[PDB]
Amino acid sequence: ILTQKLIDTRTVLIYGEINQELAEDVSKQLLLLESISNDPITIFINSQGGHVEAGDTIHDMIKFIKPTVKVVGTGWVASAGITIYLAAEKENRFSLPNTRYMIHQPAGEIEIEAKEIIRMRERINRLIAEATGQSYEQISKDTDRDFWLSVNEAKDYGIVNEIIENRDGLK
Amino acid sequence: ILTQKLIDTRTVLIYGEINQELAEDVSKQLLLLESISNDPITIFINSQGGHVEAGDTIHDMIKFIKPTVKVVGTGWVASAGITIYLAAEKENRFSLPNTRYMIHQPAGEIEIEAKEIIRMRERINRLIAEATGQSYEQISKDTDRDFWLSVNEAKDYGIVNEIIENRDGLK
Amino acid sequence: ILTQKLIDTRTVLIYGEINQELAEDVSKQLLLLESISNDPITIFINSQGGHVEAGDTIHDMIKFIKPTVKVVGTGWVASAGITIYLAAEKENRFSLPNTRYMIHQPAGEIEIEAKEIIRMRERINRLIAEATGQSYEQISKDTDRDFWLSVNEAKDYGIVNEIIENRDGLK
Amino acid sequence: ILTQKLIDTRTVLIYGEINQELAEDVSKQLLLLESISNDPITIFINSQGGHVEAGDTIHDMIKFIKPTVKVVGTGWVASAGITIYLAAEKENRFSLPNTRYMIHQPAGEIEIEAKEIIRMRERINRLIAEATGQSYEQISKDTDRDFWLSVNEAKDYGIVNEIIENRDGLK
Amino acid sequence: ILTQKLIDTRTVLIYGEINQELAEDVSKQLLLLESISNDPITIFINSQGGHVEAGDTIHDMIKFIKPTVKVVGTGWVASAGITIYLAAEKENRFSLPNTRYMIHQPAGEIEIEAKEIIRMRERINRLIAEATGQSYEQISKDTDRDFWLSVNEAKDYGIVNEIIENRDGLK
Amino acid sequence: ILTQKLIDTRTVLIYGEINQELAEDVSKQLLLLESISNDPITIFINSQGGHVEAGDTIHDMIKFIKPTVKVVGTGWVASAGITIYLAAEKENRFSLPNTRYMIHQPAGEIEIEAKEIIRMRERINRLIAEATGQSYEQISKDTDRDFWLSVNEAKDYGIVNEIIENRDGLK
Amino acid sequence: ILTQKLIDTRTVLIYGEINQELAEDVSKQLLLLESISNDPITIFINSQGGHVEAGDTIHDMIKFIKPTVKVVGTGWVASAGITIYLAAEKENRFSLPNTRYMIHQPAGEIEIEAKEIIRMRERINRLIAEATGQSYEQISKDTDRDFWLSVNEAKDYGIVNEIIENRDGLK
Amino acid sequence: ILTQKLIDTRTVLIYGEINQELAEDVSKQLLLLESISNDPITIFINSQGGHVEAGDTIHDMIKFIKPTVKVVGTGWVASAGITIYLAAEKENRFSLPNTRYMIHQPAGEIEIEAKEIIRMRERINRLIAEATGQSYEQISKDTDRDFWLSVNEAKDYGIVNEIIENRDGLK
Amino acid sequence: ILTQKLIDTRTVLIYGEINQELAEDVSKQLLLLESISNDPITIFINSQGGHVEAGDTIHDMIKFIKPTVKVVGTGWVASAGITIYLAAEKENRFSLPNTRYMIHQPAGEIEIEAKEIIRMRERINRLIAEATGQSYEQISKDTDRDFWLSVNEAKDYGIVNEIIENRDGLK
Amino acid sequence: ILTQKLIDTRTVLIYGEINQELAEDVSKQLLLLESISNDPITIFINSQGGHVEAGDTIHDMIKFIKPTVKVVGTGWVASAGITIYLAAEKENRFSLPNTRYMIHQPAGEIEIEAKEIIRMRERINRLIAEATGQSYEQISKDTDRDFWLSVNEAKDYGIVNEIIENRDGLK
Amino acid sequence: ILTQKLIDTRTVLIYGEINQELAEDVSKQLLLLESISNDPITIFINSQGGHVEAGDTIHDMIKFIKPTVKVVGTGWVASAGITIYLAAEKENRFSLPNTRYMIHQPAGEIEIEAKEIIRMRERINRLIAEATGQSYEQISKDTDRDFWLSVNEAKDYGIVNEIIENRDGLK
């Protein structure tokens, strides 16, 4: 009965480095909660990012499942973590006060590798633009280097919709 | 009761490097699900590839079991991962939006080793040809180096049959 | 029945290095206790600190949940550990007698990194100011180097509210 | 109930390096299934080989237990793995389509070691000869170096009796 | 129910290096089976040997317990493994067909150490003598170097009593 | 029910290096058995020794608990292992046949360390003298270097009381 | 007589990483050649860069001595190497045909370090601007990232004055 | 008088990996020999290649100095070694009989790095084209992978002009 | 004067592994002795072999220089060492009595490497055939595995011409 | 003038491990002394042995040169060192009083390796037999294990001819 | 001229660990000094000991050479250092005031090793008895453990003859 009442809260924690092992763990939890009901799921994210394709899977799984997903940013949300965060609809994107956000152009035969990283950076930047309401050209410009945003700046930028301190903030 | 409802979902996750340990885990899961019913099985694949013979085992196990197998490509599907992906019939090969695909001629007394790597590369290329509907000569030409395909390019090529974003896409 | 009666005590221990794994563990415990009842939660903290953003998550989680949280400092409470400690309301901040407290300006492209360390140090110092009743200028000055305070000095400083030796001290 | 239904399938998986730890695991599994009923046991083998005496134990345990043992080769079966594979009666030796097979003379005071390796290689070659129907001289000649066989070549050689793609193939 | 049926078989496996950890594991198994009934216990041994005093413990435990112990050599039995094998009465010493056996004078202030290794070798050679029926002088001579014996040579030597291939061999 | 019947045997195994971890494990087992009943406890010891203070704890715990403790030496019993062995009353000190015993003066600012090693050596020697019946002077002389005793020599010396080969030897 | 003839050529080679050891070596050679005569000195430079302050020393030593210094770029001249290269007057700056050039902003308590790197980057950029004839703002803009120039591009830019293939090109 | 007589032979050996240390060594020898007289210089080259810019320096220094340079390939001449080899005029390019030759496209932020590697390969391929008499397109095609030529093949390709066995072959 | 009289003996020692550093050393000595006079040179060789191309250089350098070269094998001459040894004319090939000789097929993208290793083995075998008077066929056959010859067997094979014990044996 | 007078002493020291580097050093010294005069040479040997083929070379070089060689054993002479020692004629084999001597059968695909070790051991034992006057059977028997001899026993055995303490002992 | 006047002093320093390299260095110095004149030689020894056989060589060389050798102990003289010190006649054994002395039984197929260590200890103890005037039985008793002597105790023991502080003390 230790995780029984935890499963009832319909909450997933994504804390730490984004990798395939974490993507598998998160995928299993989301698939389980979907099999139980169509009630909303809340995801808390504290992540510096990590593996791009692992980030892509979690993102797509969030949109794949039937239940509506709310995200709460906490501590920091960066890179691959941002891709996950942005899978939720703008209305459902929350942040705790002590959180900073970061977008950038991630790292990844040299001709083949260069082309892939270019295509990956385009795909990621179009994803960020579509989710935030910013233009593709604006994202491309800002993600030239490590672009760190405070919680209030990330709100103005269109990443965070609502800054909350308490439970009722989720309503 | 934790995995009991996740067994009911008839879902197998293949995330990360393909090796004999993963092959054993996947083989056990597929054999368990077959022993329960002949209902369809869904496999989510996120793999950069790995061990060729482990890939062959998973591929053959998919064809060996009675239940129909559906595959969903997510994040990336490359090398030995593709061999597993192509085990399902073309009708049952799906992909999530944020996925890239890759086929190549994989790495593997020198005269003995050379002959093995050639025979293996033929066997893999003919497997890909038969599955995608492409000619053996086309596959052999394209797999000369790391041949990366976007989700849409993978669809045209005959790897992916249908790109889906939601649950109802599996129908 | 082993943790069943331990859960009844509504107690969380935060001992050792603050990191994302501990934050996840602490988050799960708090969300579990919240789902059971709205009765007060007691946290015993013995921590030299560690990962700033993990400390931020725990701090914000304490304020996020409905139940009132009491903190009890033991051994030492320092750096990111102080951030967690200060999440509780002043009246609910207790210390055991053999405890020392430390505040400082923590550690963390060089221009970008320098800006982030500055902003982080501001954010942390303002958090400490608001919680202790000390002015931002006093905190900023004192945290210039490792600022250790005995238990009585920490009470005078506004970090600790009450020094207790026994159960009835919590009353 | 996770392994309960897996035990009913009477299937043993031998994937990876042959060693004493795997030999112990396989022995326990075979002795457990023997204690339940005299019904047949299916063994799937994907092995590059490994420890000669560990392979001898599994070989001899297969012939020691009362139930009839079917082997299915998958991915690759080589060296000590072949010795295990050949423990089954020719009638009961199956292969999945994507499998390659190898026989060689395995590696192993120097005079003593030389005599032991000679005796061991004789013992192994006679074992292979008896099981495949090939002459000792033919095996001895062919195993001089790493002798890789395709699935069809392995059938022609007398290692594999039947190549199967589906369940009803086992019949 | 998994080891419940395995305990019913009254079978102990001694596979791998002989050391104190394995001696503890085996001791617990032998004491557990002794506490249940006085029915015979079958031990399968595949061991290159290892720690002398750990082998002495297993040897003495086999004789110490009330139930009659049958030993079955498999793969190989050497050094400390032989000492364990010979704990059983001659009538109860069996071997699978693919097994080799080895006796030798094992490895072990220099004057003290020398005396101990001498006494240790004396003790072991007398134990082998008593168990096989051969004279102490003959054992001392044969154990001067690594003395490898095929299964049939071990039978002729008085180590193995009967070579069995099937279950009915133990009768 | 796997350790349930093993608890009924009232047997403790002390195999391997004597350290604080083992001392904790043994203390818990002895305390558990004491809490159940006042029936005798049998301890099998196979140990080369190790940490002096860990040995001291096990020794004192044996004498502390109410139940009578019988000790059975097996393989070897040396140094800190002997301190533990000698905690049992002479009448309750048994040995399996293949066992050797060793006593010596154990290894341990330099003036402080010298005094401590001196006092420790005296304390240990007086303990051995008292338990065996040998004089302190004889012990102090014999323990000057590694003093190994065969099973029969250890009986004469007063360490072992009865050499047993079977269960009924304990009567 | 080996270096005697080599000293007569009045040639200094700066090949490899710029560090204090190399700076000491170059300083000694320049001081030696200065003490002999006021005839021109030729320096061949093949350097990826290295230690900023070591480069500064070499640069300043080149200007400090009385003889006129000619520089010939070869292989590559980058970062700290460029600072050395630009110590010579524009008229005396040559390049062999197979050479590439690079200017960039080099890497270097955080507030202090950041301020120093800023000052260092201004100092270096002003040094480059003065030597090439480019404006400070142009250098500051171009050195934002790794600015690799071909030999012809470096001449146009104002780093190289004349590209030579033969001895008489120095004239 | 050891290197004195050796200096008269006017011979430079380039054996082993091409790096900056070797470039400095070779440069000094070439500059020393040029200062003594304008007589021809013979270079013996046995090199697998190495650092591209080191090879460029040596290549350019050969053309820079006044004396005519003859090259003799020996053992193998590959990659950066071939660049050095091709610094000599075609009439002055010799080979010993037991020599093989290799040209390829060498290995060398990712957009910046990819552009440099591309420019480097074009530069090397044009250099090879000019020196051999082969067209740029042929060289570009042939260097796609490791292109090993035997001594007679290198002669036909225009790398080697004359295969010599004895001194009189240099004439 | 320490090497002055050692150069007068016109003796070169090739002891140890054949590599490019040794090839440089040997090349310099041979060129030095050539420039002094046309008198014969004696080479003593004790080598297990090593780098194939380094052996090729030394072999070719021996045939390149004007003076007649005599070889004296000592201890062992194997692999690349044999290639060097066989550079001398048959009449000039000597051996000390305690020497053994070995020829084999040396070790050396996979299709490319395979082609190179095949060509290399043919080149070496033809070199050995021509020098010893054995047919290419015989050499090709004998070099299948490590082919060790005693000094008298090496003489019969045509590797060694004369076995000498004393100075006057060279005459 | 430092080694000039040391060369006048016509003494060679062979101290430490026998390897190819030492063999080269010793060969150069012997060849230098031979070129000066035909006067006798004295070798002092203190060696535990080492590389067999390096010892073979020194042995053969001692017999090869025209000057008569005297050997003086000191400290110890063992294995390969004994082979060197026995190169001198019996009359010329001396020992200092504090020396011990050892002969054994030295350590050294497995069928090929075993043959080589057997032939090598026979060669060494026949060398020892011939030098000492002992029969081959005696040497073969004694060298079965490490056969240590005191200086007087080594004299009796025919290894040492004369034990000397002072200069005039060489006479 | 640096060591020229140092050679005139006829002084040898033996400082640090006794090993074969130091034995060679010392041997060369003694032989050099012997070849120059028969004037006395002075050896200063500061050594904790080291390699027994190396000490034996130095000991024997001191007695072997014609000149008289005086030894001066300084700092410490222990173990193999003592063996060297005791090579000089009693009349010629001096000590500086701040020196301690130690004798003990040194450390060093286990039966063979034990036999060798016994013989070695006897040989060393007899050597020490003969040089000191102490009986063999007394030396054997005193060397049971590390036996340290002050400079004055060493004089009383017969190791040191005369304690000196100044040059004139050698007279």
Beta pairing partners, H69: H41
Single out the residue of D146, D125, D138 nearest to residue D83, CA to CA: D125
Beta pairing partners, B93: B71
Separation CA C104–CA C81 (nearest Å) = 11
- Pairing verdict, β C11-15 and D11-15: unpaired
Single out the residue of B49, B31, B51 nearest to residue B41, CA to CA: B31
> DSSP strand E in F16-157: where?
41-47, 69-78, 93-103, 147-149
- Pairing verdict, β G93-103 and G147-149: antiparallel
The greatest distance separating any two alpha carbons of chain C, rounded to the nearest whole angstrom, comes to: 55
Q: Which residues contact F58 (CB under 8 A, 6 or more apart)?
A: F14, F18, F22, F23, F26, F27, F83, F84, F87
CA angle A64, A65, A68 (to 5 degrees): 110
* Residue J64: Cβ within 10 Å count: 24
DSSP annotation of E112: H
For C104, the 3-state DSSP assignment is: coil
Conformation bin of residue K46: beta by default, left when phi > 0, alpha when psi is -120 to 50: beta
The residue assigned the tokens 């990194």 is C113
Integer angstrom CA distances of residue K99 from F110, J52, K13, K169: 22, 44, 15, 16
DSSP annotation of I5: H
For an interface test with K, which of J25, J74, J171 has the most K Cβ atoms less than 10 Å from its Cβ?
J74
For K28, the 3-state DSSP assignment is: helix
For C108, the 3-state DSSP assignment is: coil
The residue assigned the tokens 């979690």 is A58
CA H5 to chain centre: 26
Across the D:E interface, residue pairs with CB atoms under 8 Å apart total: 84
Task: Give one DSSP letter per residue of C43-61, joined into a string.
Answer: EEEEE--B-HHHHHHHHHH
* Residue J107: Cβ within 10 Å count: 11
Which residues of chain G lie closer than 8 angstroms to H6, CB-CB?
none
Separation CA E78–CA E102 (nearest Å) = 4
Single out the residue of E145, E128, E146 nearest to residue E137, CA to CA: E128
Burial class (CB in 10 A: 0-12, 13-18, 19+), A170: middle
Residue contact H113–A110, C-beta within 8 A: yes
Integer angstrom CA distances of residue E141 from C3, C107, E138, K106: 64, 71, 5, 33
Q: Which amino acid is at H23?
A: A
The answer to whether the beta carbons of residues B114 and I111 sit under 8 Å apart is yes
- H or E stretch at B76: strand B69-78
Integer angstrom CA distances of residue H1 from A5, F19, G6, G104, I4: 92, 71, 17, 48, 9
Q: Which amino acid is at F9?
A: T
Separation CA A71–CA A50 (nearest Å) = 18
The residue assigned the tokens 């204090």 is G20
Single out the residue of A1, A92, A12, A7 nearest to residue A46, CA to CA: A12
Burial class (CB in 10 A: 0-12, 13-18, 19+), F14: buried
Give chain E's contact residues with F (Cβ, < 8 Å). 3-4, 20-21, 23-24, 27-28, 31-32, 34-36, 53-54, 56-57, 59-61, 63-66, 109, 112, 115-116, 119-120, 123, 127
Q: Which amino acid is at J80?
A: A
The residue assigned the tokens 């969300």 is C31
Q: Which two tokens stand for residue F79?
A: 């140094």
Q: Which residues contact K137 (CB under 8 A, 6 or more apart)?
A: none
DSSP annotation of C19: -
Please tell me the experimental approach by which this structure was elucidated: X-ray
Single out the residue of E10, E14, E9, E23 nearest to residue E45, CA to CA: E14
Q: Which two tokens stand for residue K156?
A: 């009383």
Q: Which amino acid is at K21?
A: E
Contact: chain G with chain H (3+ CB pairs below 8 Å): yes
Give the dihedral of Cα atoms D107, D110, D116, D119; nearest 10 deg: 80
Terminal Cα distance for chain G, rounded: 27
- Pairing verdict, β F93-103 and F147-149: antiparallel
The answer to whether the beta carbons of residues E143 and E105 sit under 8 Å apart is yes
Q: Is the dihedral of CA H110, H114, H117, H123 positive or negative?
A: negative
Beta pairing partners, H42: H11, H70
Q: Which residues contact A105 (CB under 8 A, 6 or more apart)?
A: A121, A124, A125, A143, A144
Is H104 considered catalytic here? Answer: yes
Separation CA G69–CA G61 (nearest Å) = 11
CA angle A133, A136, A142 (to 5 degrees): 95
Separation CA B164–CA K15 (nearest Å) = 82
Terminal Cα distance for chain I, rounded: 27
Q: Which two tokens stand for residue F137?
A: 């002077």
DSSP annotation of J25: H
Integer angstrom CA distances of residue B6 from A33, A34, B3, B11, B96: 10, 10, 5, 7, 21
For an interface test with B, which of I110, I111, I117, I144 has the most B Cβ atoms less than 10 Å from its Cβ?
I110
Which residue among H24, H27, H60 places its CB closest to the CB of G97? H60
Beta pairing partners, H22: none
The answer to whether the beta carbons of residues J31 and J7 sit under 8 Å apart is no
Domains of chain A: 1-171 (3.90.226.10)
Which residues of chain H lie closer than 8 angstroms to G8, CB-CB?
35
Is B150 considered catalytic here? Answer: no
Breaks in chain F, named by the residue before each, with C–N above 2.5 Å? 108
The answer to whether the beta carbons of residues K48 and K80 sit under 8 Å apart is no
Separation CA A116–CA A128 (nearest Å) = 18
- H or E stretch at E124: helix E110-132
- G33-48 burial, b at 16+ Cβ within 10 Å, e below that, comes to bbeeeeeebbbbbbbb
Integer angstrom CA distances of residue K60 from F151, J72, J93, K69, K70: 49, 11, 17, 12, 14
- A78-98 burial, b at 16+ Cβ within 10 Å, e below that, comes to bbbbbbbbbbbeeebbbbbbb
Single out the residue of C39, C8, C45 nearest to residue C26, CA to CA: C45
Beta pairing partners, E148: E102
Q: Over the Cα atoms of chain K, what is R_g?
A: 16
Q: Which amino acid is at A36?
A: I
Neighbours of chain G (3+ CB pairs under 8 A): C, H
Task: Give one DSSP letter per residue of D107-156, joined into a string.
Answer: ---HHHHHHHHHHHHHHHHHHHHHHH---HHHHHHHTTS-EEE-HHHHHH
Breaks in chain J, named by the residue before each, with C–N above 2.5 Å? 108
The answer to whether the beta carbons of residues A82 and A128 sit under 8 Å apart is yes
For an interface test with B, which of D17, D98, D100 has the most B Cβ atoms less than 10 Å from its Cβ?
D98
Query: For helices K110-132 and E110-132, what crossing angle results, to 10°?
Result: 150
Single out the residue of A68, A69, A96 nearest to residue A160, CA to CA: A96
Q: Which two tokens stand for residue I156?
A: 């019969």
Q: Which residues contact H26 (CB under 8 A, 6 or more apart)?
A: H12, H14, H58, H61
Burial class (CB in 10 A: 0-12, 13-18, 19+), G90: middle
Neighbours of chain C (3+ CB pairs under 8 A): A, G
For G112, the 3-state DSSP assignment is: helix
Beta pairing partners, J12: J43
Single out the residue of K6, K75, K3 nearest to residue K45, CA to CA: K75
Q: Is the dihedral of CA B49, B53, B56, B60 positive or negative?
A: negative
> DSSP strand E in chain C: where?
11-15, 41-47, 69-78, 93-103, 147-150, 162-163
- H or E stretch at B96: strand B93-103
Q: Which residues contact J1 (CB under 8 A, 6 or more apart)?
A: K4
Contact: chain K with chain D (3+ CB pairs below 8 Å): no
Separation CA H37–CA K82 (nearest Å) = 64
* Residue C74: Cβ within 10 Å count: 18
Across the A:H interface, residue pairs with CB atoms under 8 Å apart total: 17
What does the H/E/C string look like for chain A?
CCCHHHHHCCEEEEECCECHHHHHHHHHHHHHHHHHCCCCEEEEEEECCECHHHHHHHHHHHHHCCCCEEEEEEEEEECHHHHHHCCCCHHHEEEEEEEEEEECCCCCCHHHHHHHHHHHHHHHHHHHHHHHCCCHHHHHHHCCCCEEECHHHHHHCCCCCEECCCHHHCC
CA angle H140, H141, H144 (to 5 degrees): 85
For F98, the 3-state DSSP assignment is: strand
The answer to whether the beta carbons of residues E29 and E61 sit under 8 Å apart is no
For an interface test with A, which of C56, C63, C122, C128 has the most A Cβ atoms less than 10 Å from its Cβ?
C56
Q: Catalytic one among J47, J51, J59, J79?
A: J79
What does the H/E/C string look like for chain H?
CCCHHHHHCCEEEEECCECHHHHHHHHHHHHHHHHHCCCCEEEEEEECCECHHHHHHHHHHHHHCCCCEEEEEEEEEECHHHHHHCCCCHHHEEEEEEEEEEECCCCCCHHHHHHHHHHHHHHHHHHHHHHHCCCHHHHHHHCCCCEEECHHHHHHHCCCCEECCCHHHCC
Query: For helices K20-36 and K52-64, what crossing angle results, to 10°?
Result: 10
Burial class (CB in 10 A: 0-12, 13-18, 19+), K63: middle
Burial class (CB in 10 A: 0-12, 13-18, 19+), A100: buried
Q: Catalytic one among C47, C51, C59, C79?
A: C79
Which residues of chain C lie closer than 8 angstroms to G111, CB-CB?
114, 118
* Residue C30: Cβ within 10 Å count: 20
Q: Catalytic one among I51, I79, I140, I150?
A: I79
The answer to whether the beta carbons of residues K160 and K95 sit under 8 Å apart is yes
> Percentages helix, strand, coil for chain G, rounded to the nearest 5?
50, 25, 25
Integer angstrom CA distances of residue K166 from C101, K11, K96, K169: 64, 16, 9, 6
Conformation bin of residue C93: beta by default, left when phi > 0, alpha when psi is -120 to 50: beta
- Pairing verdict, β C147-150 and C93-103: antiparallel
Give the dihedral of Cα atoms G146, G147, G151, G154; nearest 10 deg: -140
Residue contact A111–H114, C-beta within 8 A: yes
Tell me the H-state helices in J66-109. Answer: 80-85
Q: Determine phi and psi for F107, rounding to 5 degrees.
A: -75, 160
- H or E stretch at E16: none
Q: Is the dihedral of CA B120, B123, B128, B134 positive or negative?
A: positive
- H96-121 burial, b at 16+ Cβ within 10 Å, e below that, comes to bbbbbbbbbbbeeeeeeebebbeebb
The answer to whether the beta carbons of residues A93 and A162 sit under 8 Å apart is yes
Separation CA K94–CA K73 (nearest Å) = 6
Integer angstrom CA distances of residue B135 from B13, B131, D97, F64: 31, 10, 21, 83
> DSSP strand E in chain J: where?
11-15, 41-47, 69-78, 93-103, 147-150, 162-163
Separation CA B39–CA E4 (nearest Å) = 33
Give chain J's contact residues with K (Cβ, < 8 Å). 1-2, 5-6, 8-9, 11, 13, 15-16, 44, 46, 48, 74-76, 96-100, 145-146, 148, 150, 164-167
Contact: chain H with chain J (3+ CB pairs below 8 Å): no
* Residue K144: Cβ within 10 Å count: 10
Which residues of chain F lie closer than 8 angstroms to E115, CB-CB?
148
Which residues of chain J lie closer than 8 angstroms to D121, CB-CB?
none
Q: Which two tokens stand for residue G127?
A: 């040094």
Q: Which two tokens stand for residue G93?
A: 């700056």
Q: Which amino acid is at C80?
A: A
- H or E stretch at E163: strand E162-163
Which residues of chain I lie closer than 8 angstroms to H98, CB-CB?
56-57, 59-60, 123, 127
Q: Which two tokens stand for residue K135?
A: 């009986």
Separation CA F132–CA F140 (nearest Å) = 13
Q: Which amino acid is at J56?
A: D
